[PDB]
Design a protein around this nucleic acid. Structure first.
Lengths: 416, 94, 196, 52, 153
RNA sequence: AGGUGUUGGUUGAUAUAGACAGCAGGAUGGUGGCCAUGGAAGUCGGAAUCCGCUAAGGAGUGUGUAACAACUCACCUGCCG
């Protein structure tokens, strides 16, 4: 469902903003994550011996802030008999905020995506490592494994493992033992390897495909005795699936013992896919400047001269623009318009005066610029393709172009 | 389109020399026929002019020069260089 | 269809000839479709346009020549796209209506010119064009401060000349109209005898 | 580069033509069937693709 | 230096992607100011497109509204304030009383292109069918209701 | 599955009231018709698909653009028989 997922992604991103900046006291802040497979039975055990051990903390305040906040979490996971698909994140404790004010809190939700992580801390605030770089860590990969005794299709998220499909076959011998028959018994024995590996080319159209497109941003093919090199390079193997094959892995093991080994045989190419998907777009932007057609902009004054009109195709952005959006609102005249400010102009600047009628021009609260471009990304175009600056062409991009672009569609006639 | 073609005639009409077409070094020769008179116009620059009392003999002689100048190896929608037919009709008018 | 379509027009000509005993004869060389239905808004109460094919006009006369011998004179008076703008109330106020309302526009790249069009100096209002396909025809001008003000007063189109290709396309850069597009009258049919 | 009405004379023999879909032939622009015998006088004609 | 330009802007309410600026960016006026110039001057047309005329001088632009065909049909069929989610076919079908159509044939008298009032009502009813409506029988019935005793002035 | 080689057959329209070539002059406004879309000026798209004017001009045959512009063809005219 399009409407059912997209209420859950952007809404829960604003709940994780206000809880992290909690800023309470002592060390009475139960931060917690259970991975989905585990029993809830092995948690009501552990937190039973963390109630007679937590009674020998010397300080009067710290110890009872704990043993109040430990027996509130004891009755949250009684309502859970099991732990669902995707886990359970438990935030308990007792904050302090505006106005010298104590307010207790005790959250427990099933997230989106099956996470794998285990966690138990008690700091002065709330902890978030495995929420803001796994549920943010998006693009998926696909893992085929090939051998004479089986095959198996499975995925790898950031830190998740699913086993989609697998199927065994009884492959023949190699070793011949006649004369005339031993000629044709070699065509008749290699013949029963072709309709195996075409039942792995064709079963790659069952599991990995979606909406005249494949549902992954990469691919890896495993095996041993060189039987990836007979699926990887054949005419029966599909064009778009053949063009994402990122690896030819040779190993010991196979099946469920050797699905785990191909995840840590490609630790240097699983983290080298956005480093090409972002480098092509920074390479494609300097080829527009090379050519004599003239479809490119730079600055926060020329990109707003040419985004309100015919809006740009792919809005090119360096994530860390320091520039942000401040709205201006006059005293007597009541006249208002939205503006953008550079390094010096935002800190100390009494140039903000009405001038026309001679009055004070006050500025109502701000709004970040990479955040405001996401308030209107489907409005003025589509595809918010944010880019980075680590690479050999990403390096000069930011300082060379100040962090902004815009590959325009039609022949826009600039004036300067 | 760069290399101007230089045409020069012999035998009071019957042979035709064609130099520097694309800037080739080799020099084409064409032989018009007997009962047909080749020339160079007085009112235009690179204008061959093909006379005679017979439509067949005349017009085959037109076509030999026009198929001396055909481009090899190259995209022919772009290099449009040659010698091709302009005006048919008659030697004197009534 | 085209069987019951002609059955209303032979009844319209026996109606319009008896109703308007005075007449005109006009053509249509370069006169458009909006231009007709601007001059349709002019004399509507006292002019009704009725054009047509030749032999449907030739046949309609044969039924009339028994009744009116005065319609004998319009059997060799049909050359061009002939029409008959009818008239009764006044023939010196309908013709001088279409004299002072000729609807103008820039000329065809084809039609000859009655006048011998003399050319003064001018100014366009553009950037850098070229004086490379202009100096062939024989007006050797000067590119004087952006807009090319004309130096030489040499005529291009005169009485009878065919406005062809090379001086027709180079006048789309300067934007001018010599004439006003309108119907040039040929004959006048008043009361059963032709008088100008 | 070139005179602009010595290009309608040079394009006429190589650019303003028609093609057999079945035998890649070249025929005058105002055709309906191929000339040759190999395609069997077909009417799958299509024009010669323009230059940019 | 007069130069009258025709800009089919959003009318009453303000839009989204303003492409007025190739006309108004190489000459002077701001790309924020013209979107709110039409916000008041048109008034209660609400969300009806009318191609507005600008008397472009040295000084400032005179805002005045052009006569049209599709603006008078959606305004007479009466609406309260509306949303932008927009159901399949926003098109309507009520009953336009014949008091408004004969009044619009006197407003058609000022554009000035036609014969008498036996042939300006059939082309105002010709513009009314495009939205969706009928006045006691469809425009099949309005070639038979006009002749003999229709509301002719 | 196909052919404008040539040859028999079947049905229905266009014509001396001037067709069929070819060779010439028109191909409109309310109107930029309304629902969608950043635009739908006739030309991806959606169902709906009218009249003032007439010798004739269709709520449109294709080529072309971000919207058009700009150039054809439906339908009629002069020559010709």
């Amino acid at each position: 469902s399009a409407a059912d997922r997209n209420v859950e992604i952007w809404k829960i991103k604003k709940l994780i903003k206000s809880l992290e900046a909690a800023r309470g006291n002592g060390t009475s802040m139960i931060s917690l994550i259970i991975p989905p497979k585990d029993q809830i039975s092995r948690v009501a055990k552990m937190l039973a011996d963390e109630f007679g051990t937590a009674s020998n903390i010397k300080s009067r305040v710290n110890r009872l802030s704990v043993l109040g906040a430990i027996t509130s979490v004891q009755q949250r996971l009684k309502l859970y008999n099991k732990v669902p698909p995707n886990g359970l994140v438990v935030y308990c404790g007792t904050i302090v905020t505006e106005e010298g004010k104590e307010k207790k809190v005790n959250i427990d939700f099933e997230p989106f995506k099956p996470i794998n992580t285990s966690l138990y801390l008690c700091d002065n605030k709330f902890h978030t490592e495995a929420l803001t770089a796994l549920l943010s860590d998006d693009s998926k990969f696909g893992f085929i494994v090939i051998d004479g005794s089986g095959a198996l299709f499975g995925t790898l998220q950031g830190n998740t493992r699913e086993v989609l499909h697998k199927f065994t076959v009884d492959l023949p011998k190699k070793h011949g033992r006649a004369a005339q028959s031993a000629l044709r018994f070699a065509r008749l024995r290699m013949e029963k390897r072709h309709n195996y590996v075409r039942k792995v080319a064709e079963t790659a159209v069952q599991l990995f495909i979606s909406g005249d497109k494949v549902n992954v941003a990469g691919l890896v093919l495993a095996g041993s005795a060189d039987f990836k090199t007979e699926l990887s390079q054949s005419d029966m193997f599909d064009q778009r699936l053949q063009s994402k094959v990122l690896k030819l892995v040779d190993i010991s093991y196979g099946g469920e013992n050797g699905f785990n080994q191909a995840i840590e045989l490609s630790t240097e190419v699983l983290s080298n896919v956005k480093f090409i998907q972002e480098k092509k777009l920074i390479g494609r932007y300097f080829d527009e400047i090379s050519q004599d057609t003239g479809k490119y902009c730079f600055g926060v004054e020329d990109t707003l001269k040419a985004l309100e009109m015919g809006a740009v195709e792919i809005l090119i952005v360096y994530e860390n623009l320091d520039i942000m959006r401040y709205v201006l609102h006059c005293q007597g005249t009541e006249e208002e318009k939205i503006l953008y400010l550079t390094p010096e102009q935002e800190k100390d600047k009494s140039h903000f005066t009405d001038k026309e009628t001679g009055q004070e021009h006050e500025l109502i609260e701000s709004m970040p610029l990479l955040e405001w471009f996401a308030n209107n990304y489907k409005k003025f175009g589509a595809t918010l393709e944010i880019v980075t600056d680590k690479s050999q062409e990403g390096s000069q991009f930011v300082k060379g172009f100040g962090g902004i672009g815009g590959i325009l569609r039609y022949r826009v006639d600039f004036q300067g | 389109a760069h290399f101007p073609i230089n045409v020069v005639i012999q035998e009071n009409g019957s042979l035709v020399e064609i130099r520097n077409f694309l800037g080739e070094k080799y020099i084409r020769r064409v032989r018009m026929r007997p009962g047909v008179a080749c020339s160079v116009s007085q009112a235009q620059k690179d204008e061959l002019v093909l006379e005679g009392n017979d439509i067949e003999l005349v017009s085959n002689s037109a076509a030999l020069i026009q198929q001396a100048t055909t481009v090899k190896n190259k995209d022919i929608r772009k290099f449009l260089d040659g010698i091709y037919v302009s005006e048919k009709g008659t030697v004197q008018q009534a | 269809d085209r069987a019951t379509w002609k059955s209303n027009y032979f009844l319209k000509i026996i109606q319009l000839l008896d109703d308007y005993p005075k007449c005109f004869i006009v053509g249509a060389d370069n006169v458009g479709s909006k231009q007709m239905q601007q001059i349709r808004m002019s004399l509507r109460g006292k002019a009704v346009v009725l054009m047509g094919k030749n032999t449907m006009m030739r046949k309609a006369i044969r039924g009339h020549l028994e009744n009116n011998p005065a319609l004998e004179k319009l059997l060799p008076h049909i050359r061009g796209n002939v029409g008959f703008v009818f008239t009764k109330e006044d023939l010196t106020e309908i013709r001088d209506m279409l004299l002072a309302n000729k609807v103008p526009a820039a000329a065809r790249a084809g039609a000859i010119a009655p006048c011998e069009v003399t050319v003064p100096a001018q100014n366009t209002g553009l950037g850098p064009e070229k004086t490379s396909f202009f100096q062939a025809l024989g007006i050797t001008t000067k590119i004087s401060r952006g807009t090319i003000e004309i130096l030489s007063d040499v005529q291009l189109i005169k009485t009878g000349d065919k406005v062809g290709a090379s001086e027709a396309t180079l006048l789309n850069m300067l934007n001018i109209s010599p004439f006003s597009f309108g119907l040039i009258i040929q004959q006048v049919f008043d009361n059963g005898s032709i008088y100008n | 580069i070139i005179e602009p009405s010595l290009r309608q004379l040079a394009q006429k023999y190589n650019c303003d033509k028609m093609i057999c879909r079945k035998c890649y032939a070249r025929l005058h622009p105002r055709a309906v069937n191929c000339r040759k015998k190999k395609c069997g006088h077909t009417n799958n004609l299509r024009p010669k693709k323009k230059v940019k | 230096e007069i130069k009258v330009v025709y800009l089919r802007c959003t009318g009453g309410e303000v839009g989204a992607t303003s492409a007025l600026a190739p006309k108004i960016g190489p000459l002077g006026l701001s790309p924020k100011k013209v979107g709110d110039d039409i916000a008041k001057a048109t008034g209660d047309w609400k969300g009806l497109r009318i191609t507005v005329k600008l008397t472009i001088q040295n000084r400032q632009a005179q805002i005045e509204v052009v006569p049209s065909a599709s603006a008078l049909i959606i305004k007479a069929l009466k609406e309260p304030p509306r949303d932008r989610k927009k159901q399949k076919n926003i098109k309507h079908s009520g009953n336009i009383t014949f008091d408004e159509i004969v009044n619009i044939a006197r407003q058609m008298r000022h554009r000035s292109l036609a014969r008498e009032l036996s042939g300006t009502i059939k082309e105002i009813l010709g513009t009314a069918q495009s939205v969706g409506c009928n006045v006691d029988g469809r425009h099949p019935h309005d070639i038979i209701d006009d002749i003999n005793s229709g509301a002719v002035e």
